Symmetry: D2
Subunit: 120 residues, 4 copies
């Protein structure tokens, strides 16, 4: 699959993931520093039988921003595809939703994009 | 009362979820739209200790659209919040990314919004 | 075309628009003069006649003669005619930020507009 | 500033004028999709940005109809202009097609484009 291992995005975030045989993604998401207060559980899913025509491998995962040290009352989902090779990449778009009151729900969700590589 | 239960979106998709004490979401999703049949595995995360100021509970989950019957070579993530009440609701926005070639990657990702209720609309 | 006129979203905003013969959208977006802003956009002036909606989009930059939020919203969507006509949209709201804060510069959401408030 | 000729990462050409009243006007030539030749664009920008180093917020729309083709669709780009040595406009976009109600769930694509003064 090529997905299991450590990945790094353009802002230094570190994505430590295992791609299980039946489509599970499990691991930890942390900052470049890696201190415990910066580490969070992640879980997701990937296509464990991708096409063989040169297409990428679809995947997604979620981090809720709560750990044993802090709680930002929010969660991010990344949706994207893995592209293999010597310059392997995971190319994603993400949504970060915070818990809000109904009056503030219109501004609950940020959108962005992250690219991950196997090299810092 | 809470996130654990059976939910339906505005199109009649069925979201059967369990919210574990450790912040885990697990369960199955059945889509009313697209190249999909029967149940698919989902996993995700939710805030197990939400704020006490009237705010909703943040959460997210992923389905990869492969099961024993079909494989669409794609995955959806839903990002949103649970809002308690007499008509409990989960309001989400979603991203659906297909595996593509690089030349087709610009059109790889659909976006939308789904609202879920424990009463089927 | 059915687009020209006054529209109301789900949260009390008012969208006043003219759909010109050349594909232009022009008008004002509100929420009193302190809360009114120019909008401009484009729509498909020759949509299909097969039950499909009419694609369109517009932008508001949140500056007027009284206030300036240093931000701008774009709405992308389609007009759906009939007895209960609608403009169904998704939107992106980008703020001007420093580079260090750019990762959190953009909100996303959805607005539904009706011809009755 | 914003007025000039810009190119996205895929080679699309964005020829824009930023007027004194906050107006964006010009033409767009897409490098992808059911598109050919130039299309009209209109939009808006913040004509009095902050003076603290922040970017200038802006947005614009293209409806994909011209004298040669009609894709029955429209794209909006929302983003900010970042001045300096190599000026850049960083955007996210939404591309909605006209659909029936039963197909509306798949009506909207999302992505991100970055524009510079140099061809990629
Ligand atoms: C409310 O968000 C938070 O509390 C929070 C906290 C941390 C943290 O503790 O860094 C150690 C990191 C992020 C974060 C978000 C994010 C994102 O959305 N796309 C790309 C990566 C990424 O990292 C968010
Ligand atoms: C007080 O200034 C305003 O009127 C104002 C200010 C902001 C702001 O502070 O963004 C920095 C945002 C909006 C706004 C409205 C709106 C809408 O109706 N649908 C979609 C998004 C959206 O954003 C309006």
């Amino acid at each position: 699959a090529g997905i299991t291992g450590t990945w790094y995005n353009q802002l230094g975030s570190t994505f430590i993931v295992t791609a299980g045989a039946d489509g599970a993604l499990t691991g930890t998401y942390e900052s470049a520093v890696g201190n415990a207060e910066s580490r969070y559980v992640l879980t997701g899913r990937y296509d464990s039988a991708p096409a063989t025509d040169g297409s990428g491998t679809a995947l997604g995962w979620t981090v809720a921003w709560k750990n044993n040290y802090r709680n930002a009352h929010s969660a991010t989902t990344w949706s994207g595809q893995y592209v293999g090779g010597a310059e392997a990449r995971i190319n994603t778009q993400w949504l970060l939703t915070s818990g809000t009151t109904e009056a503030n729900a219109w501004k609950s969700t940020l959108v962005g994009h992250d690219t991950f590589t196997k090299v810092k």
